[PDB]
């Protein structure tokens, strides 16, 4: 005889407000959706200087997770004809035609499978025209389409050509089309003055407060800024995007679709998918070092399932994300620290809160 919101906060305290004490992580929020209905829970402090408590309106560095409104992005240009994901970044950006990276389409970069991208840029780039060169003097490595490496240059080259395809800088794309479109208040490229009091610090393995540093393409790769609240509206959208008008409701769909598979981790646009349902191990496995660090020769889809789940961690100097759906179940949740713990820890918390709620 105890109300759903109180069963859902008595999970997450038993399975995630361990973790501040035991990895020392200043402030917290856990969000859960079912059944298009959100629970919010926030823990600890937004800054430790400061004293100011974890909140609604508290901004937290998304670090990766911001890959998938680059995804989003993408599947929106798609879906108004601006963009296939058969072209190559030259149509768009006339200084890369006839260059070796030309000869790599818009879906193996935003796929991590360019065969010659590892995950940061050389710490030398830094301006456009670094930017420009870098991509300019590229030469591949592994054959085209075969092997994936996690890189910030190659989706950060996807969300680059995706804002030239809509006549926008990209931190436009997000902030004016696609926000806005998902119902979004709350989200940012770059957090203005008057919303600088909300922006949480992060906190460094040494609890020292840091926030992410400017970098090359890094608002598509990991530069996006976003609530718990906004976070949640999010998920929502993805659990239902038939609710949504035509354009964002395509962009959303066109994330969901598996393009080849590693193991039993289906890579989609942005997202990670698995067969649901799915065992803990399997979720594990998607964020090892072998998956995350190194390249890892891609199969075809051959086992196309029925029923999905899919999740993505994110993580800054900072911060640490993990955001999780399950269409079936019409749940989601979101987690947003401002200090980084271990990717198991998140994933783990997550799946018992998950398949524990009634
Ligand atoms: B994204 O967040 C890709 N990613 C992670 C980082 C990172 C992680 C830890 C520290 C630092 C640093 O000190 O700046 C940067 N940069 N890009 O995805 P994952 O790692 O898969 O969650």
Redesign the pocket.
């Known amino acids: 005889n105890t109300p759903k919101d109180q069963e859902i906060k008595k999970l997450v305290d038993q399975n995630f407000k361990p973790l501040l004490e035991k990895y020392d992580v200043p402030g917290m929020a856990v969000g859960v959706i079912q059944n298009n209905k959100k629970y919010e829970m926030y823990y600890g402090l937004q800054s430790v200087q400061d004293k100011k408590a974890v909140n609604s309106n508290t901004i937290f560095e998304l ?3 911001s ?1 998938l409104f680059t995804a989003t992005a993408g599947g929106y240009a798609k879906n108004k004809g601006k963009i296939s994901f058969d072209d190559t970044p030259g149509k768009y950006w006339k200084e890369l035609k006839n260059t070796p990276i030309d000869q790599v389409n818009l879906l193996q970069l935003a796929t991590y499978t360019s065969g010659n991208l590892a ?2 840029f050389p710490d030398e780039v830094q301006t456009d025209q670094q930017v420009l060169t870098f991509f300019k003097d590229w030469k591949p490595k592994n054959p085209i389409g075969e092997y994936r490496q ?1 890189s ?1 240059p190659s989706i950060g080259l996807f969300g680059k050509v995706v804002a030239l395809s809509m006549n926008k800088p990209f931190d436009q794309v997000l902030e004016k089309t696609i926000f806005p479109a998902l119902g979004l208040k709350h989200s940012y490229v770059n957090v203005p003055k008057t919303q600088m009091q909300n922006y949480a610090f992060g906190y460094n393995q040494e609890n020292q407060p840091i926030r ?2 400017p970098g090359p393409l890094d608002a598509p ?2 530069g996006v800024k976003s609530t718990l609240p906004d976070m949640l509206s999010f998920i929502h959208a993805n659990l239902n995007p038939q609710k949504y008008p035509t354009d964002i409701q395509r962009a959303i769909n066109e994330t969901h679709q598996g393009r080849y598979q590693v193991n039993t981790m289906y890579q989609a646009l942005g997202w990670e998918e698995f067969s649901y349902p799915a065992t803990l191990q399997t979720l594990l496995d998607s ?1 090892s070092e072998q998956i ?1 660090m190194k390249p890892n020769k891609v199969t075809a889809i051959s086992k196309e399932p029925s029923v999905k789940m899919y999740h993505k ?5 900072g911060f640490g ?1 993990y955001v999780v759906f399950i269409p079936k179940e019409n749940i989601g949740l979101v987690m947003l620290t401002n200090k ?1 713990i271990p ?1 198991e820890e998140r994933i783990k918390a997550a799946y018992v809160v998950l398949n524990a709620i009634k």
């Open positions: 670090g990766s997770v890959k995950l940061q996690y910030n992410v540093n790769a990991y964020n995350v961690t994110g993580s800054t100097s994300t980084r990717n």
